Structure 1
């Protein structure tokens, strides 16, 4: 049975298999169970990445080295490959004879231990058509008598859903729980494993790189356990140096390389922002101000919040920034958010909250619970942010949604993690949560029934408190109140729309020229403080786009031309000088 079972001691002697550091309490309990009279079959149950196989495989490494109790010395540990047992078991009884013969060898020497990784598999292996004769029944009578010792290793999910079902087999196996190690316990493990990884990549790791890898992975890599998680950052870091030229950075990997690897794994911006990104970040405020005017206060809050995150002063577990942009209509609340993601080159997560008007609609964000038709679909918000952890989350018209939906965002702003129906935890630490609401629009624009008209600006704030619970408003970084667009900024907005018009006309091959006098006429004609700048988009469409459209289809503008717009002082009307060219 040499092909089905390998001798770990032989492998550990000629080479090395993950030298175990620590785990004295875990290995002592396992040795205690293995020294029992009956049911001396430990079961290393733990989460993936907690060193279950390391403890079993490392036991052999310890035995050869000699740091084991005298009772455990002289013993041989064998690893069972369940795939090799069922290799040629075509004929009836090939598995039973093959498996039973293997157990006889262990009983003869009476000093050998069997390691069966993924022990949950043997529960049903060996059934040909409808029989219960399997490795579980074939081993069962030999485990309760203490003739042989077998070490098992399986995950909690497999142990609870499969292994725990067989009460008879579970009783024979003594569940030895394995707990994730601490931050300090992990650095000593990497130090013991470092000589094996250094030789593979022919590099060297610094004392600070190891401490940073463990700490940085725990913060950002929240999907795997600490022992495997930290090793991934170390193993992948050395690979970069090997791929890089032998002369530039092949000797050693600095701490800067560790943060770069973790950033790519978590899809988050790396620390020590380069000068290239700094130029874009510094100019973010100026670029935004060229597309949105009259709301410089809001741009400052958004840009400043992002700077704190990159600079390293961001919140420990809260998002980059949580804001509730409230104000009049058409004042740039959604435009600033749509133009923020483009400036930073990140995905835009636009959510229309006018659809989440019912309590039952919350299942779309976090997914339906288990046992329902909607379990496969999953949460739309949790899935969207997992694929794009670095993005801008926009909840347009959040006030329209039911108050129940607001409660979901309490942990998104206080803790930064949302638990999906499947159990995974979304991460909002690098998400710029932005919310827009038009609450108080009726109240602020209303006219008081009195002699002295009143400043109803303070009425929207009161509505914000009635709709949003204090616990929700307290989590927000700050509430920015947008102001009505003045006559001076309206002129800039007109230029923006005219520029967009030129882009449309440029595709057709015709160039537009509008005199400054005409621009002022359009501004005063469609200037409505209460209605924002959306009416300005219609005074241009009716005055400029409508004549051009008729000429483009029926006129000289079919081919590339140079149209001009002018205002006659006598009539105060627009004149369109269409030219065929």
Structure 2
């Protein structure tokens, strides 16, 4: 009767019901069993992916023993799992440990009784461990495990198991590499489907069967460092902390709206004897701003009850299903003894899933990521945990699911008015991506951009992070004129091993791992070295780039942007000069004639496989004066954001528009110094006028030209 408290008990746990019911894995179990019974050494070791189950397979073995699904030579035995703390911490004195080493191993060799040994991590035996604290690399069991005397079952991971080979190359032929396979996602559906009984009895909340498949397949294409059973099981336990917090008690949304009552109304008391400057303008705002806040308050509590009224309907009508079935479950199913409720009340109960539950299906598209009173598990609530866990910033493309995505064309049209056909292809790509549609191994959003130097080639690009992600952090500027060298290829993919910078991973490979959902620039491609273009032909083609780790990087849901100049050599004699009329007869056909000749340059510099790689090539028209009316006016909207501290509100009449344009604009420079022409005459002298006390706090500067060639100091209240 060994104590076994030195390790830990293992068989009685299934006797205690803690491990009853494990999805078996029959190709794996017999590899353990057929290792055990031979004449020679009897040492299986589980070697495989860290993300796969290691311990749970051996926990399956104990359940196979108690039910008798074992051969006669393996009946009755008990596994012993080992508490690794009790080796070194049990050494209170030197002479008091190794008697336990005699207590174990004399029960290992000639005991001939119930004996099965388990090791959590063999690294805690051979990689760690003092010679005086227990078994190390220099202790016994090396010439013992030739013989089939002692039967242990280990568990290690592959790349760390390679340390045992390079350590002394002697355990290599004493232990046994049993390769543990990844569990092949469609089987993990069958694993989690067997686990429907346990989680629904763990915490009660009903789990839909759409999302169970969606918990696994969405875990594939997005999460890489974890693997198939860890991804499939943690998310449902991470489905707890989203649902258990919100469905118990009041949800978080109502708590968020209660914060704005006391935080915002606190500032009314803070200005009583404060007759100083502008800050009393908030009284024109804060009363109206509270009318903006408190209307959101009144709707949420009314909608919360209606959703709670669905809880009052669903939770009672599901109780009626026990009446309608159990009477029929015992020989009335062979006799159909009521032809009354088996057709009437059952179908109408299904009609409540066709009426009350479809409203909750209809509840999702405006409650995309949260849930006020929802006991189901929708797929967007599963993918929100991906947004919660992976490198996702706050409110963005995916946070406005399936309804704001159509409105994203409007906001992007508020940046560059001109060049619809470019943005139309940009409009569809987000609709391909964030709407649960086809995400291929092609990265979503690959577009070539061509135009003269000056037009909004990278304007488009900044706003795709400023307005879409609302974060300005998914932008990755890549100066391709810094890659003019032939050696500069290694700056992306990393350096070859043993050489300078192998501790680095590559400059652009590293930034994508930190932000796996981002927008990627390539700024000045016409100067870039021709062999760096050889790298990009597989980046647009496939997601994968192997690295110094040979790690796999995906570029799914990453918009890759390919701005380059390439046009000032062809836009040459100002062909599109004064395209203000935009030319239905000629201009249009010039855009056909130009763009095919730019594909010729894509055949000339690029070795034209990029045409096969890129989804869609866009060509920018140069700016027209009808464009320059509204486009220059947008800078004056953002002018008041930085200068509301200064509180000079510059008003621009239409007379002020053409004075800026007609002295500065050309189709060559693409209205780039026109905004500098704003900055070079009027904007330098605001710093001097702010020093002395003329236009300091409340002075409405009316800027106008009466064909008088001077800004006016006509000022109002």
Counterpart for residue 87 of structure 2: 85
**Aligned pair 1:522/2:664, yes or no?**
no
Q: Paired residue for 1:540, among 678, 682, 690?
A: 678
**Aligned pair 1:188/2:171, yes or no?**
no
Q: Distance in 2 between matches of 1:17 and 1:132?
A: 30
Contact 1:378 1:421 (C-alpha < 8 Å) held by counterparts: yes
Q: Which runs of 5+ in 2 are unaligned?
A: 249-310, 312-371, 576-589
Tell me the secondary structure at the aligned position of residue 520 of structure 2: strand
Using structure 1 for the length normalisation, give the TM-score: 0.89
Q: Paired residue for 1:397, among 524, 535, 553?
A: 524
**Aligned pair 1:307/2:310, yes or no?**
no
**Aligned pair 1:291/2:415, yes or no?**
yes
Q: Which runs of 5+ in 1 are unaligned?
A: 449-453
Using structure 2 for the length normalisation, give the TM-score: 0.73
Q: Which piece of structure 1 moves more, 86-95 or 471-480? A: 86-95
Q: Distance in 1 between matches of 2:150 and 2:208?
A: 45
Q: Which piece of structure 1 moves more, 313-322 or 506-515? A: 506-515
Contact 1:18 1:54 (C-alpha < 8 Å) held by counterparts: no
Contact 1:319 1:413 (C-alpha < 8 Å) held by counterparts: yes
Contact 1:34 1:42 (C-alpha < 8 Å) held by counterparts: yes
Q: Distance in 1 between matches of 2:168 and 2:687?
A: 77
Q: Distance in 2 between matches of 1:184 and 1:306?
A: 28
Q: Distance in 2 between matches of 1:268 and 1:445?
A: 44
Q: Check 1:523–1:319 CA distance in 2 against 1; reply closer, same or farther (3 A cut).
A: same
Q: Which has the higher helix share?
A: 1
Counterpart for residue 710 of structure 2: 574
Residues 514-545 of structure 1 show CA distances to partners (whole Å, capped at 9, x for unaligned) of 33223222222222012211121232223322
Contact 2:402 2:435 (C-alpha < 8 Å) held by counterparts: no
Counterpart for residue 371 of structure 1: 498
Matching of residues 463-482 of structure 1 within 5 Å: 463-482=601-620
Q: Which has the higher strand share?
A: 1
Offset of residue 456 of structure 1: 6.8
Q: Paired residue for 2:125, among 122, 133, 145?
A: 122
Q: Paired residue for 2:483, among 333, 340, 356?
A: 356
Q: Check 1:274–1:458 CA distance in 2 against 1; reply closer, same or farther (3 A cut).
A: closer
Q: Check 1:517–1:379 CA distance in 2 against 1; reply closer, same or farther (3 A cut).
A: same
Matching of residues 482-561 of structure 1 within 5 Å: 482-553=620-691, 556-561=694-699
Q: Distance in 2 between matches of 1:86 and 1:567?
A: 88
Counterpart for residue 405 of structure 2: 281
Offset of residue 342 of structure 1: 1.6
The Cα RMSD (Å) is: 3.1
Residues 335-363 of structure 1 show CA distances to partners (whole Å, capped at 9, x for unaligned) of 11111212112432222222122233333
Q: Distance in 2 between matches of 1:105 and 1:425?
A: 47
Counterpart for residue 314 of structure 2: none
Q: Which piece of structure 1 moves more, 356-365 or 329-338? A: 356-365
Contact 1:370 1:421 (C-alpha < 8 Å) held by counterparts: yes
Matching of residues 422-441 of structure 1 within 5 Å: 422-441=549-568
**Aligned pair 1:41/2:168, yes or no?**
no
Residues 304-328 of structure 1 show CA distances to partners (whole Å, capped at 9, x for unaligned) of 2111222333332222210111110
Residues 207-238 of structure 1 show CA distances to partners (whole Å, capped at 9, x for unaligned) of 43333322222232232221222111222224
Q: Distance in 1 between matches of 2:108 and 2:706?
A: 106
Q: Check 1:288–1:71 CA distance in 2 against 1; reply closer, same or farther (3 A cut).
A: same
Q: Check 1:394–1:195 CA distance in 2 against 1; reply closer, same or farther (3 A cut).
A: same
Q: Check 1:461–1:188 CA distance in 2 against 1; reply closer, same or farther (3 A cut).
A: closer
